[PDB]
Amino acid sequence: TSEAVKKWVNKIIEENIIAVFAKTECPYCIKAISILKGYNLNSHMHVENIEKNPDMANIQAYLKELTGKSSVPRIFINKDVVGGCDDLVKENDEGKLKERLQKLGLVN
């Protein structure tokens, strides 16, 4: 159950190069996802809405164990912690996001 939730989160992060944990009607989730889709990352992206899930609290606690925060969006790229939307904005603006994606063969 604790194990089940951890395995499920892990599976999301490990099966998808770009993994975003999000919730319903959240501007910073929407913004982050929109930025990532701007790199045409769709084919390698998975967005999980964790608010529509009976185990929301457990998922958030685990995301905090992994990354230091329980808030959404929580963004992983090839298993590495990017963080939230503000972290993504900083990486994108400073060229770090593009470099990440280049190394993954995702942007030419």
Domains of the chain: 1-108 (3.40.30.10)
Asked whether residue 91 is marked as a ligand-binding residue, the answer is: no
Strand order of the sheet with strand 18-22? Answer: 45-49, 18-22, 74-77, 80-83
How many Cβ atoms from other residues are within 10 Å of residue 40's Cβ? Answer: 12
CB 33 within 8 A of CB 47: yes
CA–CA distance, 70 with 93 (Å, rounded to integer): 24
Residue 108, marked binder: no
Is 44 among the annotated ligand-binding positions?
Answer: no
Residue 73's φ and ψ, nearest 5 degrees, are -70, 150
What is the sign of the dihedral through the CA atoms of 68, 55, 24 and 81?
positive
> What's this structure's resolution in Å?
2.0
